[PDB]
Amino acid sequence: RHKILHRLLQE
Amino acid sequence: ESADLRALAKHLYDSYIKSFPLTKAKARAILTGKTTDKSPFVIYDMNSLMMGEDKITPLQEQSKEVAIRIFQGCQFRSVEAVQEITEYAKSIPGFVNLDLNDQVTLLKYGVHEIIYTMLASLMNKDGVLISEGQGFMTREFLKSLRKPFGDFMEPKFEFAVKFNALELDDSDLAIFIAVIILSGDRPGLLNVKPIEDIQDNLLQALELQLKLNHPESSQLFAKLLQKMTDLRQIVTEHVQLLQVIKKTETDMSLHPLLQEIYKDL
Numbered sequence A: 001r002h003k004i005l006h007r008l009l010q011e
Numbered sequence B: 001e002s003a004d005l006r007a008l009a010k011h012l013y014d015s016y017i018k019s020f021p022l023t024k025a026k027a028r029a030i031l032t033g034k035t036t037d038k039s040p041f042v043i044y045d046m047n048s049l050m051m052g053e054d055k056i057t058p059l060q061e062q063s064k065e066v067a068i069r070i071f072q073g074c075q076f077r078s079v080e081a082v083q084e085i086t087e088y089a090k091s092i093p094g095f096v097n098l099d100l101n102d103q104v105t106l107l108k109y110g111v112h113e114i115i116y117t118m119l120a121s122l123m124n125k126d127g128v129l130i131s132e133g134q135g136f137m138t139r140e141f142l143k144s145l146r147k148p149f150g151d152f153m154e155p156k157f158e159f160a161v162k163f164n165a166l167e168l169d170d171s172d173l174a175i176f177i178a179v180i181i182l183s184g185d186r187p188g189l190l191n192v193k194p195i196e197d198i199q200d201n202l203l204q205a206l207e208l209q210l211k212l213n214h215p216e217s218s219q220l221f222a223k224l225l226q227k228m229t230d231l232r233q234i235v236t237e238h239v240q241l242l243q244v245i246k247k248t249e250t251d252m253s254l255h256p257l258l259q260e261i262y263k264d265l
């Protein structure tokens, strides 16, 4: 977190 | 085993083809003039920069200096690659089953090594395919760039030459790219062990791929393993440039995605 990766990971 | 090693070899390629719109196959086809139906503008100086400049980087424009325009296309193109690689990653068997923090960690560290691997596909001795291949920038013109930038790519062209001499293809590259991502020695990984079992399966699929797809390179596997660590050099080199544009070089704000990534490594 790393907020943007995460969202890109979540979907 | 060696049928699911073929199985997994194919899955990756399929997903590689899904996630990566520009392939070596296309890049090589254009580079050698085989699609004279896609013949690329040549940027060789400030002068041809201008004319090729006119092909997002919006009203975000401001005709500033050469190097800031080049900063912005790099930045935008990095953002896209991060997304493709990530989507590709999401498709490596078992990747999603891992702890979220470690899936993040692998991308944090895997992402630039793959950006530079892929860059080699776009390069030869004299320059680089840009703008989805509708463009070709010379090595010589990248050398005329001032300040910290003129001698940055030189070590990437060397090595893009050395690594292209391995005549790897898209199906080869797919597994190599997954091997890199699934590497358990990244700083800050929580659960190393599951990653290693994943990487070992990939290492083996690759081994086979290479014996199959290139039966007369004898030791291709070993040659290709070594590039992985040249890649980390390439990358600490990268990291150390960001560094100089962090302090000196006002005006060059990293994209927040790229901020997340270059931060604590």
Ligand SMILES: C[C@H](CCC(=O)O)C[C@H](C)C[C@H](C)C(=O)CC(=O)[C@H](C)C[C@H](C)C/C=C\[C@@H](C)[C@@H](O)[C@@H](C)[C@@H](O)C[C@@H]1CC[C@@](C)([C@H]2CC[C@@](C)([C@@H](C)O)O2)O1
Binding pocket: B022, B067, B068, B069, B070, B071, B072, B073, B074, B075, B077, B078, B081, B115, B116, B118, B119, B122, B128, B129, B130, B131, B137, B142, B145, B149, B152, B153, B238, B242
């Ligand atoms: C092919 C490139 C120009 C193409 C373009 O103007 O569009 C050559 C380009 C000069 C590459 C190097 C970075 C360069 O000299 C940079 C430069 O002065 C500016 C001032 C500093 C940097 C932006 C700071 C931030 C990021 C960059 C360092 C980083 O971007 C690059 C090192 C690295 O990213 C290499 C390249 C550029 C971006 C990219 C992900 C792109 C290119 C096509 C594709 C699909 C390939 C590669 O997979 O991805 O790889």
